């Protein structure tokens, strides 16, 4: 089955995905980065503060319908 997921940036922009619950979120990270035209390695995807690994699933992380993934950009100082 599919799961709807909101991917939200710090400007409050939302990209809505409908992905399989058993699929690696790496595919979603790639799609989001191409959407925004930035390198994937310069973004960080968090679910309730936890870093989302490439090999993670919505199912393994306990995501439910319309849950939110927060995105942050690389920070240097």
């Amino acid at each position: 089955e599919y799961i709807k997921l909101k991917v939200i940036g710090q400007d409050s922009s939302e990209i809505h995905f409908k992905v399989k619950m058993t699929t690696h979120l790496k595919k979603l990270k790639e799609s989001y980065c191409q959407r925004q035209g930035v390198p994937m390695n310069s973004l960080r995807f968090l679910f309730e503060g936890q870093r989302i690994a490439d090999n993670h699933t919505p199912k393994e992380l306990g995501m439910e319908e319309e849950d939110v993934i927060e995105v942050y950009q690389e920070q240097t100082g």
């Binding site: 710090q10 968090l46 503060g49 870093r51 927060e70 920070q75 240097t76 100082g77």
Partner: protein, 188 residues
């Protein structure tokens, strides 16, 4: 995980990035998990732009108030600073190599702690908080080591070691941190 472009930010006088900051904080918290909680460098930004409801679920599995010490790296766009919270004396402390941005940071965190104490039914933490400037970290003398001082202070406090370091030690500290992230192993 880190890739070499993350670790490369420890070379020479490169500016450290959040992958270095956040993985090093997870090493520290793994060492003393029952005493320390390390918020990643995205917590303060999420708190600031999305309020408590933006970070409320980030403490899903965490009783903050059982810990001894909270470490909160603060990314100030082109600069790294650090908030520490010690729960015994209820002191919110701020370290920045120039003291810039003191008020907003400690107030952001104090407001957050009170809201959390209320939501998690810890009313013994609704009274007594005090803010402070961290005073005797040695002075940073260049334009690039703010992230290194921050991590060094994280490790000294979590592991209860004195800050016996100064600017001249910072190249060796970069090499140590680089080594520790490569091996995933804090050294003594």
């Amino acid at each position: 995980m880190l890739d070499m472009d993350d670790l490369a930010t420890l070379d020479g006088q490169n500016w450290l990035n959040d992958q270095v900051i956040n993985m090093y904080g997870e090493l520290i918290m793994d060492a003393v998990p029952d005493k320390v909680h390390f918020f990643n460098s995205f917590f303060h930004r999420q708190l600031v732009t999305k309020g408590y409801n933006g970070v409320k679920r980030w403490t899903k599995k965490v009783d903050l108030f059982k810990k001894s010490l909270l470490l909160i790296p603060i990314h100030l766009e082109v600069h790294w600073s650090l908030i520490t919270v010690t729960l015994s004396n209820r002191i919110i402390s701020f370290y920045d190599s120039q003291g810039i941005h003191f008020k907003f940071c400690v107030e952001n965190i104090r407001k957050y702690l009170l809201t959390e104490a209320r939501e998690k039914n810890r009313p013994e933490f609704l009274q007594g908080w005090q803010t402070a400037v961290t005073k005797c970290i040695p002075q940073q003398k260049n334009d690039s080591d703010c992230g290194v001082f921050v991590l060094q202070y994280c490790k000294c406090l979590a592991l209860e070691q004195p800050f016996q370091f100064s600017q001249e030690d910072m190249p060796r500290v970069r090499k140590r941190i680089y080594k520790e992230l490569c091996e995933c192993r804090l050294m003594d």
